[PDB]
């Protein structure tokens, strides 16, 4: 009657790379069935994950984006496949996968190109979350500025939007 699905396409996809020892992959899965027997994580739920571990301010905004991004398909529902995939990259990766994953987040439209409008959206989110943003005092200011400076710093081509290619460079330039 009730099985567990993805109990073959996953383990098989591995047999090579695996940022989650066997006994692990099937582990989070079971945790998924709980949160949702139909293997479907909706925004409402995701929103509760953060709203629970950070009731301080209103990390909500960050939950709406982080969730919309965590979903590579961006269909409104996050399936286990997408969840676990991130649970790993989010941690180890042995590759600049971190800069790439970030790009997707900084691009709501995920149109391969980010937009000053999108960058701000996120920045504004991380602003209304913790209090550290306060200590920032020294220089910097509302998000509107942070972004205006970034683009002018990570985009000397002034094209309104940037691509993963330039995004990576502008980043590796921080150090």
């Amino acid at each position: 009657a009730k099985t567990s699905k993805l109990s073959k396409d996953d383990l098989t996809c591995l047999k090579q790379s695996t940022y989650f020892d066997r006994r692990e992959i099937q582990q989070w899965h079971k945790g998924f069935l709980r949160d949702c027997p139909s293997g479907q994580l909706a925004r409402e739920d995701f929103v509760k994950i953060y709203k629970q571990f950070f009731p301080f301010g209103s990390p909500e905004d960050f939950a709406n984006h982080l969730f919309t991004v965590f979903d590579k398909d961006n269909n409104g529902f996050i399936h286990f496949e997408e969840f676990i995939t991130v649970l790993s990259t989010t941690s180890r990766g042995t590759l600049e996968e971190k800069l790439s994953w970030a790009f997707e987040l900084y691009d709501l439209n995920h149109d391969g190109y980010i937009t000053f409008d999108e960058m701000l959206t996120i920045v504004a989110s991380v602003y209304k979350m913790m209090g550290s943003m306060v200590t920032l005092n020294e220089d910097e200011a509302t998000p509107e500025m942070r972004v205006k400076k970034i683009f002018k710093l990570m985009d000397k081509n002034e094209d309104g939007y940037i691509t993963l290619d330039e995004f990576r460079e502008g980043s590796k330039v921080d150090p």
Binding site: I49, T90, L105, V126, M130, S132, R146, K149
Partner: protein, 52 residues
């Protein structure tokens, strides 16, 4: 000529959220609550605290 030093470091942090300054400690006790929340937060956060 830009001062994009602290901005790049600190920012990326919050994005990945701080390393601590949250709740207190976890332990086998939760039940009625979803397990997907504790797994992600506790993991994604403590595991992301690493930096090559």
């Amino acid at each position: 000529a830009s001062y994009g030093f602290q901005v790049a470091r600190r920012v990326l942090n919050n994005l990945q959220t701080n390393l601590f300054n949250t709740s207190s400690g976890s332990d086998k006790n939760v039940k009625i609550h979803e397990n997907v929340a504790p797994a992600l937060v506790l993991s994604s956060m403590i595991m992301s605290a690493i930096a090559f």
